[PDB]
Design an enzyme around this catalytic site. Structure first.
Site, PDB file in Angstrom:
ATOM      1  N   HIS A   1       0.826  -1.238   0.000  1.00  0.00           N
ATOM      2  CA  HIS A   1       0.000   0.000   0.000  1.00  0.00           C
ATOM      3  C   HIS A   1       0.857   1.285   0.000  1.00  0.00           C
ATOM      4  O   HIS A   1       0.288   2.376  -0.146  1.00  0.00           O
ATOM      5  CB  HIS A   1      -1.024  -0.040   1.114  1.00  0.00           C
ATOM      6  CG  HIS A   1      -0.504   0.100   2.505  1.00  0.00           C
ATOM      7  ND1 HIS A   1      -0.479  -0.986   3.363  1.00  0.00           N
ATOM      8  CD2 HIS A   1      -0.167   1.186   3.243  1.00  0.00           C
ATOM      9  CE1 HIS A   1      -0.056  -0.579   4.551  1.00  0.00           C
ATOM     10  NE2 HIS A   1       0.161   0.742   4.489  1.00  0.00           N
TER      11      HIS A   1
ATOM     12  N   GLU B   1       0.709  -8.391   0.538  1.00  0.00           N
ATOM     13  CA  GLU B   1       0.965  -7.033   1.110  1.00  0.00           C
ATOM     14  C   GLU B   1       2.458  -6.743   1.298  1.00  0.00           C
ATOM     15  O   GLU B   1       2.755  -5.719   1.939  1.00  0.00           O
ATOM     16  CB  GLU B   1       0.115  -6.831   2.362  1.00  0.00           C
ATOM     17  CG  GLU B   1      -0.070  -5.364   2.744  1.00  0.00           C
ATOM     18  CD  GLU B   1      -0.688  -4.443   1.703  1.00  0.00           C
ATOM     19  OE1 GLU B   1      -1.329  -4.948   0.723  1.00  0.00           O
ATOM     20  OE2 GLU B   1      -0.461  -3.212   1.817  1.00  0.00           O
TER      21      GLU B   1
ATOM     22  N   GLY C   1       1.079   5.328  11.187  1.00  0.00           N
ATOM     23  CA  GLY C   1       2.502   5.662  11.358  1.00  0.00           C
ATOM     24  C   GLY C   1       3.356   4.435  11.661  1.00  0.00           C
ATOM     25  O   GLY C   1       4.576   4.576  11.598  1.00  0.00           O
TER      26      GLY C   1
ATOM     27  N   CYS D   1       3.055   1.388  10.020  1.00  0.00           N
ATOM     28  CA  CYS D   1       3.156   0.480   8.844  1.00  0.00           C
ATOM     29  C   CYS D   1       4.614   0.409   8.400  1.00  0.00           C
ATOM     30  O   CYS D   1       5.322   1.461   8.337  1.00  0.00           O
ATOM     31  CB  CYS D   1       2.196   0.851   7.720  1.00  0.00           C
ATOM     32  SG  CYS D   1       0.498   0.461   8.217  1.00  0.00           S
TER      33      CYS D   1
HETATM   34  C1  LIG Z   1      -8.451   2.772  14.027  1.00  0.00           C
HETATM   35  C2  LIG Z   1      -7.425   2.439  12.968  1.00  0.00           C
HETATM   36  C3  LIG Z   1      -7.984   1.579  11.855  1.00  0.00           C
HETATM   37  O1  LIG Z   1      -6.927   3.689  12.434  1.00  0.00           O
HETATM   38  C4  LIG Z   1      -5.772   3.685  11.708  1.00  0.00           C
HETATM   39  O2  LIG Z   1      -5.585   4.607  10.951  1.00  0.00           O
HETATM   40  C5  LIG Z   1      -4.862   2.568  11.948  1.00  0.00           C
HETATM   41  C6  LIG Z   1      -3.650   2.450  11.271  1.00  0.00           C
HETATM   42  C7  LIG Z   1      -2.792   1.411  11.595  1.00  0.00           C
HETATM   43 BR1  LIG Z   1      -1.128   1.273  10.698  1.00  0.00          BR
HETATM   44  C8  LIG Z   1      -3.121   0.478  12.571  1.00  0.00           C
HETATM   45  O3  LIG Z   1      -2.242  -0.496  12.900  1.00  0.00           O
HETATM   46  C9  LIG Z   1      -4.341   0.584  13.219  1.00  0.00           C
HETATM   47  C10 LIG Z   1      -5.188   1.626  12.910  1.00  0.00           C
HETATM   48  O4  LIG Z   1      -6.356   1.727  13.630  1.00  0.00           O
END
Ligand SMILES: CC1(C)OC(=O)c2cc(Br)c(O)cc2O1
Length: 182
Positions: A41, A72, A146, A148
């Site tokens: 992504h 992925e 942040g 990923c």
């Molecule tokens: C609530 C939610 C889906 O909101 C995000 O934007 C998010 C991004 C990552 Br990366 C993650 O591990 C977990 C997350 O939780």
């Protein structure tokens, strides 16, 4: 704080760079030579920023399993003047569950971040952002935007890279030794 964090730090200090694409800043694991991995992504193009240096992408391959299902993981070969320490001998050969993992992140937003995520389940299938995905590992930690590309380790093994979460759980794509044979 303990031998889990020791192995994680050893990987972060020598085998990570900060990768920037048009889709954000990511922790990027270097595996051997000029070969690294990043979540698919991230949408890697012909040019990527590596520690804020403009870098040509020599090759990029979004991996899929032999059911033609998303994994992925994108493998990137970078036009960089320096090789990574070869860490392929720390990659698992098979799909597995793990105890006592650490998720480590290094970006402008989250420098020198280490999270003890605990038990890791071979979860398998996940609908990740609407995309059917295989070989997913799950941990019960509320991971956030942040993280990923963050590296998932146990003592002596590099087992995955963080690709998503649902607010209560986090999800990583497996790394297998077979992805990096040459
Ligand atoms: C609530 C939610 C889906 O909101 C995000 O934007 C998010 C991004 C990552 Br990366 C993650 O591990 C977990 C997350 O939780």
């Amino acid at each position: 704080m303990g031998p889990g964090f020791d192995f994680a730090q050893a990987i972060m200090k020598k085998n990570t760079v900060i990768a920037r694409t048009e889709k954000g800043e990511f922790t990027m694991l270097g595996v051997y030579d000029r070969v690294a991995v990043i979540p698919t992504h991230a949408s890697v193009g012909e040019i990527i920023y590596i520690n804020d240096v403009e870098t040509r992408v020599l090759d990029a391959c979004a991996l899929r399993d032999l059911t033609d299902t998303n994994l992925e993981i994108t493998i990137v070969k970078l036009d960089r003047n320096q090789k990574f320490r070869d860490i392929r001998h720390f990659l698992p050969r098979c799909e597995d569950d793990y105890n006592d993992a650490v998720l480590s992140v290094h970006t402008s937003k989250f420098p020198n971040m280490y999270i003890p995520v605990g038990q890791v389940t071979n979860y398998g299938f996940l609908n990740l952002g609407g995309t059917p995905t295989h070989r997913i590992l799950m941990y019960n930690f509320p991971t956030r935007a942040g993280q990923c590309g963050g590296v998932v380790t146990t003592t002596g093994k590099v087992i995955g890279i963080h690709v998503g979460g649902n607010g209560a759980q986090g999800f990583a794509a497996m790394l297998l030794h077979s992805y990096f044979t040459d």
